[PDB]
Amino acid sequence: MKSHFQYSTLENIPKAFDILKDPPKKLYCVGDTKLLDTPLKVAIIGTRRPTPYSKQHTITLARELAKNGAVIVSGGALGVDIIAQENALPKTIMLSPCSLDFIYPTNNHKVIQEIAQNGLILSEYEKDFMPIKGSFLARNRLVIALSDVVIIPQADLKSGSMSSARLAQKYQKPLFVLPQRLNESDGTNELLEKGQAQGIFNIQNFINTLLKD
Amino acid sequence: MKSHFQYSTLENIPKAFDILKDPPKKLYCVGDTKLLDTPLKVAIIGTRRPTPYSKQHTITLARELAKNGAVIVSGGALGVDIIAQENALPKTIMLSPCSLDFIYPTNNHKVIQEIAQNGLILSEYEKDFMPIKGSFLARNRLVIALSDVVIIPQADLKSGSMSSARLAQKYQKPLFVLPQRLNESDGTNELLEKGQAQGIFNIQNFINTLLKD
DNA sequence: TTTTTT
Numbered sequence: 001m002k003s004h005f006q007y008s009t010l011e012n013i014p015k016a017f018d019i020l021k022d023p024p025k026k027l028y029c030v031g032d033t034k035l036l037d038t039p040l041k042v043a044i045i046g047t048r049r050p051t052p053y054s055k056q057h058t059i060t061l062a063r064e065l066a067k068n069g070a071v072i073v074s075g076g077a078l079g080v081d082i083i084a085q086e087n088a089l090p091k092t093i094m095l096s097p098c099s100l101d102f103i104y105p106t107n108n109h110k111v112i113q114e115i116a117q118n119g120l121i122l123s124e125y126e127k128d129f130m131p132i133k134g135s136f137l138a139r140n141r142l143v144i145a146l147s148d149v150v151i152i153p154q155a156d157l158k159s160g161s162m163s164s165a166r167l168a169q170k171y172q173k174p175l176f177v178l179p180q181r182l183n184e185s186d187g188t189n190e191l192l193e194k195g196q197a198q199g200i201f202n203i204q205n206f207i208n209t210l211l212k213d
Numbered sequence: 214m215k216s217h218f219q220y221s222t223l224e225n226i227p228k229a230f231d232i233l234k235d236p237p238k239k240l241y242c243v244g245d246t247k248l249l250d251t252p253l254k255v256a257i258i259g260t261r262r263p264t265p266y267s268k269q270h271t272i273t274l275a276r277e278l279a280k281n282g283a284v285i286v287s288g289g290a291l292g293v294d295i296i297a298q299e300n301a302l303p304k305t306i307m308l309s310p311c312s313l314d315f316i317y318p319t320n321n322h323k324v325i326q327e328i329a330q331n332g333l334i335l336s337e338y339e340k341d342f343m344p345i346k347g348s349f350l351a352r353n354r355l356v357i358a359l360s361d362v363v364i365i366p367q368a369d370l371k372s373g374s375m376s377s378a379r380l381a382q383k384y385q386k387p388l389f390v391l392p393q394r395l396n397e398s399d400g401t402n403e404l405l406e407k408g409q410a411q412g413i414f415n416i417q418n419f420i421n422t423l424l425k426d
Numbered sequence: 427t428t429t430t431t432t
Binding site: 053057178179180181182189190192193199200201202203 | 266270391392393394395402403405406412413414
Binding site: 261288310317318319320345347349350352353370373376377379 | 429432
């Protein structure tokens with residue numbers, strides 16, 4: 001799917017990426033580049049197939065965080081990503097797994113279009129670059145590096161979310177997950193079990209605690 | 214409701230009770246007093262209105278602990294209590310909020326009879342004593358005192374279960390809970406949020422670990 | 427909750 005986006009490049013690579021082994025040398029952008037100056041950047045990422053429960057609270061988290069002046073960072077994926085990003089508009093930054101001349105995934109075109117229009121989309125890839133396994137992983141590192149705090153509402157084991165979670169730990173980005181029932185959201189519960197993430201037991205509280213930092 | 218139980222008195226107060234600031238001077242009993250010598254005593258207490266979710270896992274916890282030679286201690290209450298006790302039979306000990314000549318709650322009369330027959334029921338009250346606000350809270354301290362570990366599958370804030378959690382902490386009895394969604398079990402989630410309880414993220418590993426010590 | 431619990 002063609003985006004018909006009119007895109008350029010960032011003048012400067014955000015310093016957040018300096019922590020990376022191989023920081024992007026060039027970033028392509030469409031939308032509000034000033035969002036990159038937001039004091040509080042929060043990643044919300046997770047399963048492409050969230051339960052009604054997780055969706056419900058992903059919406060509250062995104063809306064309230066954006067209401068309090070934070071910007072939500074995600075990857076525009078089906079499920080958790082695109083729920084969080086739509087509900088954070090216009091304060092949201094998407095890192096694309098393809099060049100900005102392409103829309104991916106196709107079914108998210110309306111929201112992604114709105115992000116291009118009122119938020120910000122960034123890509124490491126210049127043109128005619130279709131999503132490929134390595135680019136999904138590559139952009140995942142950018143979501144984590146750019147973000148100050150990482151929220152994973154719901155996630156399975158051995159998922160991309162879990163890889164991103166390990167990146168968050170590597171870079172000491174505070175990691176929070178939604179409380180989840182047994183034998184569901186296995187990935188996030190393992191994070192809780194191993195003390196690698198904190199649970200969000202009260203959304204308004206959680207947010208005020210982030211703000212007071 | 215009269216029980217028509219034939220009951221006696223324990224020859225003396227079990228040692229576990231001597232931690233209490235006001236230990237029972239006498240305990241009345243019906244059933245198999247040999248259960249008091251079981252190495253591992255585990256309390257399973259909680260809301261009188263468990264979700265299907267909490268119910269299914271309470272059943273597994275109770276059965277598997279019994280299989281592993283543990284005795285399940287509870288108060289024979291509607292909901293979590295009686296589910297665990299019935300599934301722990303015959304290895305279960307009930308602490309009654311009333312004298313043993315009465316059945317409470319009446320809806321549990323069938324299982325309570327089975328506990329008197331094949332398990333053990335204890336009471337601090339000799340006779341003609343119906344349950345009262347004070348006797349539930351008194352009973353709770355005996356559940357906590359007798360038990361080595363306390364599992365609270367699901368509970369509301371400011372509840373009898375929470376009262377028991379407070380006693381568990383006071384008398385250095387380790388707490389454990391089931392993972393619960395946001396706004397379904399505020400009581401147990403608060404325990405998790407304050408690090409006052411540990412979550413059960415795998416029932417089989419939970420049990421094995423208990424056996425280790 | 428009348429059918430009982432910080």
